[PDB]
Amino acid sequence: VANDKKPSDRIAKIAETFVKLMNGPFKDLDPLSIEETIERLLFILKVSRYTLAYSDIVLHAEHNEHWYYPGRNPTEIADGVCEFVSDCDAEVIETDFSNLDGRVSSWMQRNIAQKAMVQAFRPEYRDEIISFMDTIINTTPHNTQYNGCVEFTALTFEHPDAEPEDLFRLIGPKCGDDGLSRAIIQKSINRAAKCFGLELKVERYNPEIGLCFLSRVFVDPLATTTTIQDPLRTLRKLHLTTRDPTIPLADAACDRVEGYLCTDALTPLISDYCKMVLRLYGPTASTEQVRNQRRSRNKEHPQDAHLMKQVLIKRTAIDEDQVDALIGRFAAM
Amino acid sequence: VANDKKPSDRIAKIAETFVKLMNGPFKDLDPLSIEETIERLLFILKVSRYTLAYSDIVLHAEHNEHWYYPGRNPTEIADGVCEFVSDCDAEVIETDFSNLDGRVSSWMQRNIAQKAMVQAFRPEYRDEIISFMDTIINTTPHNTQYNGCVEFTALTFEHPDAEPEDLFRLIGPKCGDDGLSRAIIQKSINRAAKCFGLELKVERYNPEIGLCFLSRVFVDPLATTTTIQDPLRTLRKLHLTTRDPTIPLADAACDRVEGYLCTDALTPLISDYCKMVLRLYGPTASTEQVRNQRRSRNKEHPQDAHLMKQVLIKRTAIDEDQVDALIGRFAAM
Amino acid sequence: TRALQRAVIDKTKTPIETRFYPLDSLRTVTPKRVADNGHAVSGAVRDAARRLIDESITAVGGSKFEVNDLAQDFRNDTPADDAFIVGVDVDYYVTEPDVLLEHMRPVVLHTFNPKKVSGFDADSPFTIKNNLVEYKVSGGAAWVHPVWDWCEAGEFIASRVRTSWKEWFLQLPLRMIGLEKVGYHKIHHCRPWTDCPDRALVYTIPQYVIWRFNWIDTELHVRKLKRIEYQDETKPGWNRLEYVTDKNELLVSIGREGEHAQITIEKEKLDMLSGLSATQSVNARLIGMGHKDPQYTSMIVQYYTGKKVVSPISPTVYKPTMPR
């Protein structure tokens, strides 16, 4: 659903200041060769060749590590999240956007992303990048840029008397559709989204139900960095498999449970399901080398185990006796 | 809720006379250095650097001690209150303002506080102070200035034929949203507030229910200076804790009861609650050094014990047999 | 021409700013009604203006030099250099606004700049004859003074500056040639009272001084204050006035000189009516628009035909004054 909601006059100066702060000290850049782009990490290649270099140079710089979390290993993500929650003393807010790529306006697209790309890249490459942006208007970096712009707008609205550089220095971790911010702008974020024309969903941090971030649940971010898959999103749908019909059910289930072990080995109410899938569909599945040579293969802390159990129970609103009964039923099947 | 209710023509002369009497003999002043302001007692600093000096110089002078109680130790506050009640022979009135900072009008702000600050400070600092006031329009001293202005207006309306200096010399103790005044202007205070455009709440002093001042209850101000926390405001809400979720309940309760002991050690119906909190949440709480190193730590006369008990009963409208039953129930839990 | 280059190059300005604090309080002040009920009195309006200016000046913390003819004779009071100049209803007293503007200092002035060509200002009747306003102060004498055109387009002004007799001797040979020492000012007028739309709260700030050539034009076409010419050169014996409304309307006020009746009409309607061939057509069109009031259509017809009437000068009995 395309939208053409231009922002107000005042917000334009805030957006320009945010873009300039994003530019930082990297005035000049050069495009990457086709071979280097191909070995990095059709239609994706032509934009990737420039966008990967732009991200790696500007968005992964010294003065842009405060907010651009997108682009780091999951261990690095967990470390950053724990550091941010320690800094904010467990006072953080979560942002959940609905169809951001389907809702970003033309003015935002042509005044944030296009401006940033043109300022980052060399003048001799202006035509190619502008043509690529025009083709885009009619991937990953766009969401991060939108999140950074919205964070800058919120910070500018919260403290209009501070210098833009100091305001932007407080930008918290942001990664695409998910991000973190101070809880003091919980109500003012909705007005900023309305001014830009975006829809924002915000939820106050609650230790009883855990914290939601990148479909990951932090059981107790104050002390431990233990983290698990989001139970709210996956439990209601994990019993149904959305793989293509051509794949046997056993191979898809095996890949799903292998990923779950790789990410959620010691999570209550999921380990039992994964083990029962491995016990039932496991022997009936095909050879694992066969599925490793098949395209659809990629189409999918012990100390606080008690606390993780209680946090999962709080997340799923299931009584402990009910949880034990469910665990017994799952294991005995 | 911003308001633009300018006062009448006659009231302007009264306000100017009050401002001049506030000025007194301190014609010239100088700003404080940043280091001195920092060691005194961002955004707070820029206004504090001037307002702290202005308060200390003018509002803490010899000829301005009659009304500016705000800025003294609690023992000094109790001594001043007892002296004032002895002077007024237990004939005093209490003022309770609702959202004064959210209700002071533009005319009042630009003709009381701005005028006082400009007259107090040196001419070479006029631009900085006027800019700071303009930023404020679009902390503690403002409430005291408003209370003094309203007291001066009431005194001027009561005795329009006396000299302004003699009228102002009768200004009683005032401290922010709370203050004391003569009971002879109980009805005329409402008309003065209406003229300025402010809302005033006044209650006649009643020895049976005690006197309310700074959330403090004077059991018998005629003879003793014994004072306790306000029972009306705290009893209905002391059972619920408003601390942030990240703090454990035990630490917040321990800090609350430690403060209550520091202020209300020998108050009936509160000492038992504090002791039971210390008995229950005490052992289950964390280390006290840990909470002393934690940010949320600061986020919280035996001879007349009989009289204090009876005054608390009168304040809470609870029968003595009912009070004894409640005390027994609290202790035995 | 090459003469234009001379003026462009010859800046030779000496900006002077005695840290005159901008009085933002006077600028952007919402309209106010001084009288709760009925209509306000002239004394009440004067008191309100004085109170507003006093509050602004004291809040800014500056000083003032109130004026109550060519020279203000400020030496008898010797105010401070930074103090402002404040005058209220001093149109009769001051021969020219140049008298106030020579001091090269900010001026806050409350003046009579009518938008109606005749009628009542507050409780004070006023009328325009020749080009002088025959104001009749409620509770005062009769003032006869012109209007010095504060509200015309253009924020930049040209004015004289103080000069001693020795300075006069120095500059007279240069003055006769066409060389003048000219100061520049920035004007703001607010019009703060709705019930009395004929009085304007003029505000002024000086910017810088310059030496200019009399017989050479200016690129920015800066203007110097001139007496308003209310007389209508097309219809002798009539006064015509134009002003712009806040709702995007360009109204015009017409009336005879030394005369009381007065009507306001949209300018476009007056231009359409002034070209009609027959007098009866004027009435026909006016009835078509829906104007049934005889006092309106009759005056419009009289203006159309340019009817001159020699109204007499007669004794007047004024309302008794009450100090209250």
**SS3 sequence, B294-327?**
CHHHHCCCHHHHHHHHHHHHHHHCCCHHHHHHHH
CA distance C137 to chain B (A): 22
Return the residue in C52, C55, C56, C57 with the most chain B beta carbons within 10 A, the one to mutate for interface testing.
C55
Contact C61 B9 (CB under 8 A): no
- Which run of H or of E encompasses A213? strand A211-213
Experimental technique used?
Answer: cryo-EM
In which order are the strands placed within the sheet that holds C199-213? C64-67, C84-88, C107-112, C199-213, C179-189
Give the phi and the psi of residue A178 in degrees, each rounded to 5: -115, 150
Sign of the alpha-carbon dihedral angle for B267, B270, B276, B279: negative
Give the end-to-end CA distance of chain C in Å, rounded to a whole number: 66
C chain contacts of residue B7, beta-carbon cutoff 8 Å: none
Instruction: Give which of C47, C51, C58, C193 to mutate to test B binding, by max B Cβ within 10 Å.
Output: C58
Residues of C with CB under 8 A from a CB of B: 19, 21, 24-25, 30, 47-48, 51, 55, 58-61
- Between vectors from CA B285 to CA B279 and to CA B290, what angle results, nearest 5°? 135
Query: Inter-chain contact C60–B118, Cβ cutoff 8 Å?
Result: yes
Q: How many residues does chain C have?
A: 324
In this complex, do B296 and A161 lie within 8 Å of one another by their Cβ atoms? no
Q: Tell me which residues of chain B have a C-beta less than 8 Å from any C-beta of chain A.
A: 43, 135, 244-246, 295-296
Helix pair angle (A44-54, A126-137), 10° resolution: 120
Tokens representing residue B106 in the block: 């533009």
Rounded to 10°, the helix A320-332/A271-284 angle is 10
For B42, the closest chain A residue by CA position comes to: A162
Q: Are A80 and A187 in contact (CB under 8 A)?
A: no
Q: With the C-alpha atoms ordered B166, B172, B175, B176, is the resulting torsion angle positive or negative?
A: negative
Say whether B9 and C51 touch across the interface (CB within 8 A): yes
Question: Other CB atoms closer than 10 Å to residue B233's CB: what's the count?
Answer: 12
- Whether the CB-CB separation of A314 and A209 falls below 8 Å is answered with yes
Q: How far apart are CA A313 and CA C278, in angstroms?
A: 95
Give the angle A126-A129-A135 at the CA atoms, nearest 5°: 135
For residue B144, give the 3-state DSSP assignment: helix
Q: Which chains touch B (3 or more CB pairs under 8 A)?
A: A, C
Give the count of Cβ contacts less than 8 A between chain B and C. Answer: 32
Task: Check B246 against A206: CB less than 8 A apart.
Answer: no
Taking the C-alpha atoms of residue B66 and residue B24, their distance in angstroms, rounded to an integer, is 13
**Beta strands at B174-175 and B200-204: parallel, antiparallel or unpaired:** unpaired
| Burial category of A112 from C-beta neighbours within 10 Å (exposed 0-12, middle 13-18, buried 19 and up) | buried
Instruction: Point out the residue among B135, B245, B295 whose CB comes nearest to the CB of A206.
Output: B245
Length of chain A: 333
- The DSSP code sequence of B170-195 is T---EETTEEEEEGGGTTHHHHHHHH
Query: By a Cβ cutoff of 8 Å, what residues of chain A touch chain B?
Result: 89-91, 159, 161-162, 205-208, 222
Q: Which residue has the tokens 């008690």?
A: A306
Interchain proximity B135–A161, CB inside 8 Å: yes
CA-based nearest residue to C143, from C202, C91, C199: C91
Which residue, A294, A300, A292, is CA-closest to A259?
A: A300
From A38, A154, A36, select the one nearest A95 (Cα to Cα): A154
Question: A207 and B246: CB-CB below 8 Å?
Answer: yes
- Asked if A222 and B246 come within 8 Å (Cβ–Cβ), the reply is yes
* Residues of B marked as catalytic: 177
The encoded tokens of residue C121 equal: 């200002």
Which residues make Cβ contacts (< 8 Å) with residue C79, sequence separation at least 6? C63, C64, C65
Pairing of strands C84-88, C64-67: parallel
The DSSP result for A20-51, as a single string, is HHHHTT-----PPPHHHHHH----HHHHHHHH
Q: Which of B110, B135, B195 to mutate to test the interface with C (most CBs of C within 10 A)?
A: B110
Dihedral sign of CA atoms B130, B134, B135, B136 in order: positive
Give the three-class secondary structure for A78. helix
Record the resolution, in angstroms. 3.1
CA end-to-end span of chain B, whole Å?
46
Give the DSSP letter of residue C159: B
Smallest Cβ–Cβ distance between C61 and the set B16, B126, B134 belongs to B126
State phi, psi for A247 to the nearest 5 degrees.
Answer: -75, 140
Reported as half-sphere exposure (CB side, CA atoms, 13 A), residue C313 has a value of 5
List subunits contacting chain A, requiring 3 or more Cβ pairs under 8 Å.
Answer: B
Collapse the DSSP code of C317 into the 3-class scheme (helix H, G, I; strand E, B; otherwise coil) and give the result.
Answer: coil
Please judge whether A89 and B246 are an interchain contact, meaning their C-beta atoms are less than 8 angstroms apart. Answer: yes
Q: B12–C55: do the CB atoms touch at under 8 Å?
A: yes
Are A107 and A7 in contact by the 8 Å Cβ rule? The answer is: yes
Pairing of strands C199-213, C142-145: unpaired
At which residue do the structure tokens 């006023």 appear? C126
Which residues of chain B lie closer than 8 angstroms to A91, CB-CB? 244, 246
B171 in Cβ contact with B151 (< 8 Å): yes
Q: Which residues contact A50 (CB under 8 A, 6 or more apart)?
A: A31, A32, A117, A121, A125, A128, A129, A132
Q: Which residue does chain C place closest to B19, by CA atoms?
A: C58
Chains B and C touch (3+ CB pairs under 8 A): yes
Are A199 and A96 spatial neighbours (Cβ–Cβ below 8 Å)? Answer: no
DSSP track, B2-59:
----PPPHHHHHHHHHHHHHHHTT-----PPPHHHHHH----HHHHHHHHHHHIIIII
A162 contacts on B by Cβ (under 8 Å): 43
Chain B: residues touching C (Cβ < 8 Å) = 4, 9, 12, 16, 107, 110-111, 114-115, 118-119, 123, 126-127, 130, 134
What values do phi and psi take at C102, rounded to 5? -60, -35
DSSP state of A109: I
Place of tokens 């609205």: A157
The tokens describing C50, both together, are 């004085």
Q: At what angle do helices B9-23 and C42-60 cross, to 10 degrees?
A: 30
Beta-carbon separation of A89 and B135 below 8 A: no
Backbone angles phi, psi at A216, to 5 degrees: -120, 140
Collapsing DSSP to helix, strand or coil, A174 comes out as: strand
Q: What stretches of B162-295 show up as alpha helix (H) in DSSP?
A: 164-168, 188-196, 231-235, 249-264, 271-284, 288-292
With the C-alpha atoms ordered C17, C19, C20, C24, is the resulting torsion angle positive or negative?
A: positive
φ and ψ of C112, to 5 deg? -100, 110
Chain B partners within 8 Å of A211 (Cβ): none
Q: Closest Cα of chain C to B118: distance in Å?
A: 6
Q: Which two tokens stand for residue A61?
A: 């710089």
Q: Residues C128, C135: contact at Cβ < 8 Å?
A: no
